[model samples]
Target: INKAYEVTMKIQIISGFDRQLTAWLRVHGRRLTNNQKKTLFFVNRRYMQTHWQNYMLWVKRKIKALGRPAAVGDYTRLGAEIGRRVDMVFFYNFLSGRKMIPPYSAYMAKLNALRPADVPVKNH
Candidate 1:
């Protein structure tokens, strides 16, 4: 072993690409309802748009399919590129646990520039 040199060699990697996907959602998707409207009347996308409640069990299903951590917009291959490319239901859940990806502050950073949360923005 090369002492700390060996240790340092083994560690390197987080992700900017991951958060960029999220950023596209915020900036491009703008609002989920907006994306939904574009698709609903655009025709051929009625099924895709109905992925929103636009059901009984259907209503219950939306709560789960969209869930808390997922991005707040429509996500289907039929939708536009940004909508199609980024999937968030699982991303933010995993994303919430770290600083390696730099956090959702990176969200607006992707929009232009950066926030706080249940805890303080800085040190303890």
Candidate 2:
């Protein structure tokens, strides 16, 4: 049965990131050589873990700000931005094989997929 997204916004964002990461791995995981595959999986795991911790810190700060007065944005925007930065670093370093990944368009496409869509552009 279809259910509403009843979880808190933090959980929703976390789940969304999890789903996207899984989908990404499903698409590209098999193509990697054994060593590369291992590296990719572990690196992504570490990346997500580190960023999740960072986001939680941000959430705490956001909550504090909310209690005292208010802030311009919330944890979702912070997480999205952090996720984007993490992915961009990974893409440039490992995903692209340090500027060696062939078919640059494919790599670029993957990078685009890794980007967070909910984050707004300044010019927009």
Candidate 3:
């Protein structure tokens, strides 16, 4: 029952944001136009700060709710550490064919949206 409930909740969360999430990706996914690029840099850094901080706050909350002390560290470091952990998990899943590529695709899209436009493009 617990597993079933988790699955249902997961589905709910993923689906609930489906449309708006796609819209956000479409708007900010690629290399932004000049003005948009500037906005992207500004917005991305702000998100790297704000959005990730909010995510970490939830992380801390979950940890504390489980009777653990929250990790206390630099916000940027904490965010990066969490991101690396998630990336490794997904990367392994992708290599094993246990997951589809879209999630990582979206993640990379978001990352690229945050990047400076003048960076050398690497052929993937």
Candidate 4:
């Protein structure tokens, strides 16, 4: 049938996160008696959550300063740069399979659509 890609992007987040964990092991993983590394996260999964939330606040504030119109990048850091910082989760999710779509990739979909262009008001 060849359905559209937005739905597939959602699929990628979970499955991709599953895979990103795989890579983290080899690069700097410890050799202690841990459980199966694939199903678990070797890095600071909880801190990553905090890192994620804090990063979002900075972005939201920049846009909010625009006064209801005309602002995407007040420009703390590049989007791809932020993505790279959040390498583990992003790789495990949206960025998992760039090889699938190349420059016109599924990760690009989130980059284009769900970013600042897609958000609600502050939860605070």
Candidate 5:
């Protein structure tokens, strides 16, 4: 149950505004102009602030009722640390598979900006 809850939380985090944009683009993009899509995206993203807030409140209450998980930390910090450690192949795989949100984008950018893995790497 705990593991399932963890995955559910991950799913909630992944299915946020930015991911919604990419998903929308993939689905209905051909039917809409770029500007139209951009307008809708921005409008939805604006609404997501309040939507996410309410969602988090519900999640907090649910977790409080259940009990906190073993690990707790700001997701950005955790993602950054993972970015610093994971190999390039695995990093891209995780990014593509997980549908990670914006906070994790910094970590993705950091990884992408680095010299390729085949290059003789210096210690960070």
Candidate 6:
């Protein structure tokens, strides 16, 4: 008899923000309350309806409106900065525990694969 193993996946979006910047509104906080949970779920659905591009752009505008553009930095540091801003309130760290339903993980995987490589290579 043959058996199949259950598979699990996760999607992580690391917002590259500066350490000195305050998340206030830009920070995707964690320990969501009932209202925050509802908001997150609704926003997640909306995010899937469109593409992450729209959601990312929304976050970018929110941050810039606060007088600062999105900080460009390492993913780990960015995650840490966001965590500090929100006091570990958001899922900046994507793990199996979150149980986030990413209906687009496959699509996103494909998109990342097809994403144009812009990094320049050293020419010998």
Backbone atom clashes (below 3 Å) for every candidate: 2, 0, 0, 2, 0, 4
Residue pairs with backbone overlap in model 3: none
Candidate 6 C-alpha lDDT tens digits along 22-88: 2422544454444443333333323333443443344455555755433433223332333234322
lDDT of 3 by residue, 3-63 (tens): 3322332233223223223345464446434443333333333333334335545555655
Please give the distance, in angstroms, between residue 27's alpha carbon in candidate 1 and its true position after superposition.
Answer: 21
Residue-by-residue lDDT tens digits, candidate 5, 1-124: 2333333333333334335456545744565555454444333323333344454455455546655452444333332332233233332234334643224234444433433221111212
Per-candidate TM equals 0.19, 0.35, 0.27, 0.30, 0.38, 0.22
> lDDT per residue, candidate 1, 1-124, as tens digits?
1223212211110022234444544654444444332321222111222332221233235446764632323222112332333344244334333422332233323332101111111112
Comparing 4 with 5 on lDDT, the higher-scoring candidate is 5
Which TM-score value belongs to model 5?
Answer: 0.38
How do these models rank on TM-score, best leading? 5, 2, 4, 3, 6, 1
Clashes of 5: 0
Candidate 3 regions with alpha-carbon error over 4 angstroms: 1-33, 48-53, 65-77, 81-124
**Model 5 CA lDDT for position 32:** 58
Ordered by lDDT, highest first, the candidates read 2, 5, 4, 3, 6, 1
- The TM-score leader among the candidates is 5
- Winning candidate number (lDDT): 2
Instruction: Judging by lDDT, tell me the better candidate of 1 and 3.
Output: 3
Score each candidate by Cα lDDT. Answer: 0.28, 0.44, 0.36, 0.38, 0.38, 0.32
Steric clash pairs (candidate 2): none
Cand. 2 TM to true fold: 0.35
Worst 10 residues of 6 by lDDT: 1-10
The lDDT, on a scale of 0 to 1, for candidate 2 is 0.44
